């Protein structure tokens, strides 16, 4: 019988009590990264994250930091493999930068052979050390040309350009890569990129953020989300029809949260909690499992919600071999009005829910996750049981999928000095507490989870945050990025993996 | 009778001997800048200089510096006007960043109203202080989207996209701006951008530079040069046909050099000197004055040299109200082979000339201009009489044009400390020695020169060089770019202007 802790102090850092042998022998353990965040711009074309961080430097991070050099994994990829080798990792999730292999976006314009060679070297080096690559095709870094031609995922032209890029990736790398992820966190770009404009490309309605160059926060998230689903499904069909000989698997990446009622005896809060599940997860999972959006979304969003043709619905339904689930935290939900006529209306308001980390009785959900220096009342708190709740929900609601946990992690402040940053016991506590729950849900509920990839390998540029937060299991000195030195968390994870 | 000095020491820094009253009363004196070099990327789209400096950081400068923030004239434009006001300047040359007003390149995709407002504020502030703006439409910073769509000036599609951008500039600004420059230094982009790949977009033949993404150094400079002429002429025709009501003038910017024989009694060196004039100046000036390329170029370059149709020739011939002439230095010329079949053949070899600053008797042409730390034998030296020789040549060969000197200046090393950098007596010597010759040629030869704009207002990002050289009359501290403090040269120029 398995007992996991929910509140400080945790005792799961003791690898006598919890380690990789606690899981099935075939279970994959590793870490994750993404190309904009680690590589640098050397050797590639420009993408919308270059464009957004440079046009809107105060949106790049409080420090105006960006991915121009970052940890220089373009130069130092072998040091990344050395970290993974130190960990005795068996998996690594990384992303391919579209702008590194097709700098001009559209494949017919030419490929960058040196870009292709970069990834071939990485992949060969991973396999040589027994590490399974899990390769994300699109981790938000769209070639800027495509955004400038047709506004990227706002336009249906993206589908064929994405398809041709994916086709290249499978042709060049698929003899060695057997686990492909299509689009990172389906919910994020529509909402943050086209709703709040916190992320690239930075579009929104004028009174949401007057700095936005264009947009409509009420309509564009739904347009973009729909095109992401269609683009995803077209690539999954190409993979499964034309690359079956490679013997690999493909799926999307979801951002997952759990939701609990703000007041668990209030029917309105209970209803807002269930709406949130449909609006946050079901927006994509409904299409992926049924070929239709959730009914609550159909009813609420009305003419703003695009339709799938019969052909499209069939393409999108069942378009995954597995799901990559990212999980960080859980929120309480309460009702909130949805003022569809307000010039500052956003798609995110359609769920009719207000999200908090404190419930109506004043209970904070768990330990501190991310301090908000500007407003402490908006600190994020985590909830280790949430990973259990999410996985059980996916099994029960979404047809018992094969799952890999493709991100899970926690930041420490960039204001900390090196010693403080290396003594990242808060990161041990977060990671172990979630792995305890993950083990528990696999044993208790028989959820088909087959690996776990902690975010992140190393400190890197974090979207929105610059270098103001560190998420790495290994530390990077921004004055001299060559080394990646295992933190306390990295050392811990090494022992968890090989106890 | 006017005597000017050619060699150190100069005595023309004494404003009793040389000052603005030495020139005609209507003569314009000022300084120059360009948008990539001064503004920063805040508030604009990305261009090929962003793309090139980030893809090829070792080509951006030895320091890997770029125009991301630079002197932040986006924020600090009023400080630029304050420098000009301190100088009692009557002119200022600046450039409009295409990517700031039409971030998506093609006008039909939308305009950036905040970009437009930036320039309106600048222009209004200049006029309010009695400063004549001289506005460059294109100072090399092509929207990256256009380079990625069709390779920019390599393709005839540039002509209409450039025309529509220029049309916007004249519509929005032409009620106040009366002096327009089309393309900066016609020779430069073809040769450096498509020949040697020292500049954006960085194309060349594979054995010229294996880092280049694509190109052909033998053919593409001629293609690009031709499209620059056609694009220029289409914009001059639009201006003169649709914007005559504004009562302004338009022209191109040429880079000028003078050429002298390496051995002045050797007919082969004399011939190479005259070839150089045709290949460096005549490449563009032949079209601009006759509608045809020079015959020596027709004969040598053969099928690599594009033809003008009768319609095109008529469009390009006479396509200027004035010429903006940049002038920095003069070279000796000697013969050199032109191996048209060598896989490393470049267009620059077609002139059949090798260029030096030392003649066959071991005479260096003048004072030091730019040290080359990597190879001192390749130091650049200047030649004040060259400005006299160039202007006289333009009068005699090219039909007595109206001329404004749109750049002239000298760098000091970025390794210098602030005190050393402020004590820029070498810059006084350069500027005064050239203004003495300029006065001389106007009086002696009656060349129609009506103003002079020194490069540069302030220290900025220099193409290719990062922040390793300083050209400003005012000093900028890279740790805190707000202030622009007049150097000794700025102080001198203030007194030259108002003696
Ligand atoms: C998994 O995907 C399934 C689809 O493959 C989902 O089932 C579809 O659910 C649709 C609702 O979302 C449902 O559509 C409705 O269909 C009604 C029946 O139409 C037929 O029969 C009528 C009576 O004989 C006849 O008049 C018609 O001509 C049809 O033959 C139809 O009456 C509904 O239209 C009315 O209501 C709408 C909404 O208020 C009005 O706008 C409209 O004027 C009219 O008054 C409605 O049809 C749709 O209307 C909106 C329009 O945009 C659509 O194009 C049009 O289709 C459809 O029957 C079923 N299909 C099947 C095959 O069952 C399923 O949803 C779950 O199950 C259904 C039954 C329903 O209970 C949903 O709430 C459920 O969530 C998906 N599963 C999940 C978990 O998402
Ligand atoms: C200012 O622009 C002027 C144009 O508006 C320049 O003058 C043009 O200069 C052209 C040479 O660049 C010259 O073209 C040649 O024309 C020859 C005469 O053709 C007519 O008459 C013939 C005899 O009766 C007849 O057979 C023809 O059918 C024509 O009616 C022609 O023979 C030449 O072709 C021979 O030589 C070429 C080159 O070796 C061979 O390739 C070819 O097979 C043939 O053996 C040549 O014609 C051109 O050939 C190359 C081709 O790509 C061109 O399309 C075709 O035109 C043309 O006559 C004149 N035009 C005028 C109106 O005078 C002028 O150049 C200066 O002046 C001219 C005369 C010449 O001396 C040049 O060197 C000068 O620089 C320009 N000024 C400057 C300063 O650049
Ligand atoms: C979790 O949600 C539950 C259910 O909503 C909250 O319990 C409810 O709290 C309401 C007050 O917010 C109670 O209604 C009040 O009842 C008093 C006494 O009769 C009356 O004087 C008030 O005006 C009000 O009555 C409502 O007025 C508006 C009408 O539209 C509506 O019909 C009236 O009922 C309500 O009775 C109560 N429901 C139940 C089943 O207990 C609960 O709030 C917490 O517990 C209640 C018992 C009370 O102590 C609250 O102060 C306390 O906040 C909420 N829990 C938390 C922690 O917020
Ligand atoms: C500026 O250019 C002039 C003209 O080219 C240079 O003057 C020429 O220099 C040539 C040597 O580089 C002289 O030719 C030599 O003459 C001697 C004596 O007869 C002979 O023994 C040599 O082999 C050579 O003769 C040539 O061999 C190759 C044949 O294809 C050709 O037909 C032969 O002539 C040449 O006479 C001379 N011309 C004139 C008009 O004076 C000049 O070079 C400088 O001055 C000359 C006088 C001599 O002192 C050179 O050493 C000295 O460099 C050159 N100036 C500079 C500074 O380089
Ligand atoms: C977002 O786009 C939507 C849809 O084009 C706009 O909502 C329309 O608003 C107009 C004018 O108020 C109304 O006639 C329609 O009834 C609306 N259609 C729908 C489906 O709601 C909305 O105004 C745009 N928002 C902004 C800020 O531009
Ligand atoms: C962040 O930078 C943006 C420019 O990218 C600034 O956005 C201005 O935002 C204000 C406040 O809403 C508007 O009224 C202006 O119209 C915006 N200007 C532009 C050019 O978009 C913003 O001020 C900066 N934020 C902070 C906190 O300094
Ligand atoms: C706020 O959250 C707290 C903690 O989860 C809930 O308090 C638990 O409530 C259960 C059922 O009443 C009790 O058995 C536990 O003892 C409570 N735990 C603690 C730590 O107090 C609380 O009910 C939530 N409040 C609302 C309004 O939903
Ligand atoms: C790397 O991980 C592998 C696999 O867990 C380690 O090999 C296992 O080591 C345990 C404990 O010694 C043995 O029970 C198993 O028999 C080994 N399994 C296999 C398949 O070889 C290996 O020791 C770890 N390496 C390092 C350097 O920690
Ligand atoms: C530059 O482009 C030119 C023209 O396409 C190439 O020169 C041709 O070279 C081929 C193969 O040697 C020859 O058949 C033709 O005679 C040439 N045409 C001309 C006008 O010279 C040249 O090889 C390209 N250079 C590189 C480095 O790609
Ligand atoms: C400058 O950086 C470039 C990469 O942009 C390097 O160019 C390599 O150049 C060598 C030498 O010719 C070639 O053999 C390689 O094929 C090029 N690699 C790539 C990826 O283009 C160059 O080494 C760097 N220069 C210096 C002096 O360090
Ligand atoms: C190299 O340049 C020097 C300087 O301009 C030339 O020397 C001048 O030559 C003239 C004519 O012979 C003499 O009157 C001057 O006295 C010379 N000046 C000096 C400073 O020596 C020289 O002729 C050039 N050499 C060649 C081969 O062209
Ligand atoms: C700015 O420049 C103007 C013009 O040269 C200066 O005004 C001239 O000043 C001289 C010397 O005092 C007089 O001879 C002229 O009569 C003035 N000309 C005009 C048209 O007013 C002015 O003094 C300079 N200002 C500063 C602050 O130096
Ligand atoms: C660590 N980094 C790679 C995470 C990617 S974003 C994320 C999860 C999250 C959000 C806020 C703070 C930390 C993590 N959620 O995305 S969102 O759309 O739900 O906001
Ligand atoms: C100062 N900066 C704005 C100058 C622009 S470039 C220049 C002139 C030159 C070249 C080398 C060194 C200094 C100046 N010449 O361009 S070129 O094509 O002749 O090389
Ligand atoms: C691994 O943890 C299990 C409990 O899940 C424990 O029984 C086992 O001994 C641990 N292994 C090692 C080497 O400590
Ligand atoms: C498979 O590739 C073939 C060969 O190009 C192509 O014609 C076909 O449409 C592709 N099938 C897909 C994407 O399902
Ligand atoms: C949205 O607009 C409404 C109507 O003015 C306003 O009350 C509300 O505070 C606005 N929301 C935000 C987040 O600014
Ligand atoms: C950068 O760090 C590396 C790895 O520790 C070290 O070997 C190298 O000397 C460092 N460079 C500088 C300038 O300190
Ligand atoms: C300006 O220079 C001229 C010589 O060109 C001289 O005669 C005049 O006095 C100078 N003006 C002043 C104020 O020094
Ligand atoms: C002048 O503008 C008119 C109005 O658009 C246009 O039709 C015409 O072709 C332009 N003329 C030029 C570029 O010479
Ligand atoms: C150009 O190629 C030729 C032929 O190999 C060679 O001799 C020459 O040195 C090369 N030029 C440069 C600048 O590398
Ligand atoms: Zn940058």
Q: What would your notes on this structure say?
A:
Two copies of one chain form a homodimer. Chain A is of the alpha/beta class and 499 residues long. The first copy, chain A, has one domain: TIM Barrel (Alpha-Beta Barrel), CATH 3.20.20.80. Chain A is 38% helix and 17% strand. The first copy, chain A, is built from 17 helices and 16 strands. Chains A and B meet through helix 2 and helix 7 of A and helix 2 and helix 7 of B. The complex binds a molecule of 7 linked components (NAG-NAG-BMA-XYP-MAN-MAN-FUC) (2 copies), a molecule of 5 linked components (NAG-NAG-BMA-XYP-FUC) (2 copies), a molecule of 2 linked components (NAG-NAG) (8 copies), the ligand CN(C)CCS/C(Cc1ccccc1)=N\OS(=O)(=O)O (2 copies), 2-acetamido-2-deoxy-beta-D-glucopyranose (NAG) (7 copies) and zinc ion (ZN). A molecule of 7 linked components (NAG-NAG-BMA-XYP-MAN-MAN-FUC) binds next to helix 11 and helix 12 of chain A. It is classed as hydrolase.
């Amino acid at each position: 019988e398995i007992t996991c802790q929910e509140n400080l102090p945790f005792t799961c850092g003791n690898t006598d009590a919890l380690n990789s042998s606690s899981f099935s022998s075939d279970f994959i353990f590793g870490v994750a990264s993404s190309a904009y965040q680690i590589e640098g711009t050397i050797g590639r074309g420009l993408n919308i994250w270059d464009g957004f961080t440079h046009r809107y430097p105060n949106k790049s991070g409080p420090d105006h930091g960006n991915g121009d050099t970052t940890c220089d994994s373009f130069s130092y990829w072998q040091k990344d493999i050395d970290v993974l080798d130190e960990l005795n990792a068996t998996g690594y999730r990384f992303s391919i930068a579209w702008s590194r292999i097709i700098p001009r976006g559209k494949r017919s314009r030419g490929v960058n052979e040196k870009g292709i060679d970069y990834y071939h070297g990485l992949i060969s080096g991973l396999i040589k050390k027994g590490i399974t690559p899990f390769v994300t095709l699109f981790h938000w870094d769209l070639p800027q040309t495509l955004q400038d031609e047709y506004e990227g995922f706002l336009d249906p032209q993206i589908i064929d350009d994405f398809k041709d890029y994916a086709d290249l990736c499978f042709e060049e790398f698929g003899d060695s890569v057997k686990y492909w992820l299509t689009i990172n966190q389906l919910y994020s770009v529509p909402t943050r990129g086209y709703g709040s404009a916190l992320d690239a490309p930075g579009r929104c309605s004028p009174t949401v953020d007057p700095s936005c160059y264009a947009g409509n926060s009420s309509t564009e998230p739904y347009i973009v989300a729909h095109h992401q689903l269609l683009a995803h499904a077209k690539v999954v069909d190409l993979y499964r029809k034309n690359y079956t000989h490679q013997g690999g698997k493909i799926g999307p990446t979801m951002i997952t949260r759990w939701f609990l009622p703000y007041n668990d005896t209030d029917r309105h809060s209970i209803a807002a909690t269930e709406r949130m599940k449909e609006f946050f997860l079901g927006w994509f999972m409904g299409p992926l499992t049924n070929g239709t959006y959730p009914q609550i979304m159909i009813d609420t969003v009305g003419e703003r919600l695009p339709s799938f043709s019969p052909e499209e619905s069939n393409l999108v339904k069942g378009s995954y071999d597995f799901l990559g689930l990212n999980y960080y935290f859980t929120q309480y939900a309460q009702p909130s009005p949805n003022p569809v006529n307000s010039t500052n209306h956003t798609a995110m308001m359609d769920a009719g829910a207000k999200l908090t980390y404190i419930n109506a009785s004043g209970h904070y959900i768990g330990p501190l996750f991310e301090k908000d220096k500007a407003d402490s009342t908006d600190n994020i708190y985590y909830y280790p049981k949430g990973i259990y709740s999410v996985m059980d929900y996916f099994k029960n609601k979404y047809y018992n999928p094969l799952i890999y946990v493709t991100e899970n992690g926690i930041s420490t402040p960039g204001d900390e000095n090196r010693n403080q940053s290396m003594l990242d016991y808060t990161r041990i506590d977060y990671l172990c507490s979630h792995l305890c729950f993950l083990n528990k849900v696999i044993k208790e509920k028989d959820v088909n989870v087959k690996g776990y990839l902690a975010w992140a390998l190393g400190d890197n540029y974090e979207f929105n945050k610059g270098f103001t937060v560190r998420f790495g299991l290994s530390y990077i000195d921004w004055n001299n990025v060559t080394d990646r030195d295992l933190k306390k968390s990295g050392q811990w994870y090494q022992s968890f993996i090989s106890p």
